[model samples]
Target: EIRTLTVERLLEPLVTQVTTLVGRSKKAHVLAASVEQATQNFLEKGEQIAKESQDLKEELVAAVEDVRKQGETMRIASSEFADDPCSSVKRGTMVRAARALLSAVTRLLILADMADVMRLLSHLKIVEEALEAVKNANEQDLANRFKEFGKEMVKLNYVAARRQQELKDPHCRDEMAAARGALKKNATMLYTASQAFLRHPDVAATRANRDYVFKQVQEAIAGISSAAQA
Candidate 1:
């Protein structure tokens, strides 16, 4: 639920406010004041988001700073336009400032989105490494490696579940959930099949079964990544 508060959603009202400032209105001063208030609200929210961000801290901080700078520029431009509502030059300057502010905010949102995806990808990386370790493990240590693989799988499952909930696209959400389910099911089978193969090294059936499960798990991992990126 905390992850639901996306930067894009937070910036929506500010976008509307900025757009209204450029429209034909009777009260220029009132419009300017409204834009200023909206910018201030966004700045506060942006700062909080930046503070809480785990990855891309420097980028988030710099992006927030740019938004603040653009907001100040917009405030000055709008106030100047309010002073002489009839001046075309002032109106142009204010419009340009509004555009710049929106662009800055958009960049910040993109960075936030990238950070979210990166977090999921990081978990995926760990899970992949664990999977590889389990595959390469000898019969004597297969159980231990499988246990580690299961632990990493659980972590990936949690991360993917959160991503699925936060996703805006229904199709993507479904895909992630499906992939996660597949991973869980195949991973469960993986241990038994691997054990069977280890016990009967000369048996083609057991080896094929284990390989099949491993392939399924690999495909499921890829599916989760694609869905998350989508």
Candidate 2:
């Protein structure tokens, strides 16, 4: 009884999608195959239709491109950087991890297969955010400009929740704050140069960028201010 419903439920979607294709196809137990095999079968049929009809071909190509873009958005920077699944996992953990990664990569590669494109997009966004941060900064001094922006962003939100005033209360907030501030300065300088290149990528032949970081600590005396904190 359960088997009858299971078969009926499984056939419902396929029949709805492609009655002719699935009805004539000899492959029984279609839902039981690995995802990879299912994908390959679909691609095979799509290519056949694409070669025979111009409208279908164009639609197929556009659909392919859309899937590739979706794959790009799912990409996390840390995903591919992980070590080989078989390298360190004991035999016990290997089977589970491999199955998961294989399933995931099958979807990613089949749908997107655009790792290089995704990385390029990621790098471009990084460069843009850096340049935008520095450009929006209002500090009179170049060294402190990006640092100030960092502080402003921290007030609203940050990946790590902490403040300049709160840091000093801890054992080493001052030193850590100083380190992060320097990193931000250095990061922004790259951002500035990269931003310039993006605006004029054609001018890449003659361009080189140098790093600038703020290293000095200057504590100002108490000052009188109107509305803002000085």
Candidate 3:
């Protein structure tokens, strides 16, 4: 429940908002690259988790494949849009396709992370079970299980604690908050400019502002990706 809800919220931007900027007059190439890199980053993270567990390895294999497929679709769509940057009809067509691809890629990416989170939680469950078994230990070894429990606890303590801390760290929170704000701000501008340009293609101001904001938004997304991962 938590995983599904978290991922759904995280991907809301990609699903409902990202496509609004697709038909903008410039920086299609840069935005495409941003999407490519974001999807690629997700694939790489999935690959890492894939090696750690059999089920994850198998599941992420398909997730990675789908992300790549969607990413390629975006690249191609962006390329087509770039060929004739000012044609509102052509750009609009590419935006529709890019929107689908972006949403697909985002879903796959979040799914991989959700699997990883579940895996970590499962390990905590194992530790809980081990501790309980030690408490209920009986017979001649009268608490021999406790020794093994200690070992398990020691092995996972630092790693589990580290992950916990990272999740709540002030630096991480601040960076993500700032990145999201910047990205959303620029994304709004880009979207508004795209709409303006669609109605009046000859105006240079709309195109100029759209392109500038598009770059800012791209950088902001990439910035958050690194901040969260690091």
Candidate 4:
């Protein structure tokens, strides 16, 4: 399931502020204060979501737990530096902890987006099978198979539409734009190929084209997923 959490809004500021504090010129005390204020509220909200098992995928639930651990580590390291603002070693250690926490939070957001894409892929898979059934059905079964194909196609369309909105985040805009283009290209090919096969069911070229497009769609799904997980 796709998470309902406003994950981007919650974590984006935390990531930005921590990033701003990574330099030697930045003060550990300011970062400590900012992280404390931001992280406490963030954890409380995330914990609420974590307890609702139905709202999140298994990987995301695990990610929230791991992020919690990293948040605490950052808190401790920052507090140590806050108590002693003069020491570069203390500030350096705190910065390292802050970066680790930020990294985990970024991954958490990416994983949530991946889960949304996975839902779309599931719809596409069902539609792909329906297309195959349509290709092979006897005359008596052809109409029924086509009905199922249409139903799954509607679902896949809805998912594909949502995919655009999901990819609108600013953090990975360019990379995600590329992923969206790749997926859209293959999805279009699959739809066109399926239509061609429907019109000329006995043609070997149409059947082969449909199957090849299906394979490309699957690869496109894999490509976007790999890009997200990276």
Top lDDT hit: 1
Ranking of all predicted structures according to lDDT, beginning with the best and ending with the worst:
1, 4, 3, 2
Q: All candidates' lDDT scores?
A: 0.82, 0.37, 0.62, 0.67
Question: All candidates: CA RMSD in angstroms?
Answer: 7.9, 20.2, 26.5, 10.7
lDDT of 2: 0.37
Error of 1 at 145 (Å): 12
The TM-score values for the models, in the order shown, are 0.55, 0.20, 0.48, 0.45
| Residue runs of model 4 more than 4 Å from their true location after superposition | 1-31, 44-56, 125-155, 160-230
lDDT of 3 by residue, 1-230 (tens): 33445666777775777568734446767776786788678677756766675345666676667667776776777677776687877677777777776666666666666676666555444554554443333143323654665576566555444643576677776776676556546644554555565566788986676666656755765665555557
- Each candidate's number of clashing pairs is 0, 0, 0, 0
Q: What lDDT does candidate 2 reach at residue 49?
A: 42
Segments of candidate 1 deviating more than 4 angstroms: 1-26, 125-155, 158-230
Worst 10 residues of 1 by lDDT: 1-10
Name the weakest run of 10 consecutive residues (lDDT summed) in model 2. Answer: 219-228
Task: Give the Å error, residue 195, model 2.
Answer: 3.2
Candidate 2, residue 56: how far the Cα is off, in Å: 42
How does model 3 fare in lDDT?
Answer: 0.62
Better of 1 and 4 by lDDT: 1
- Model 3 C-alpha RMSD to native: 26.5
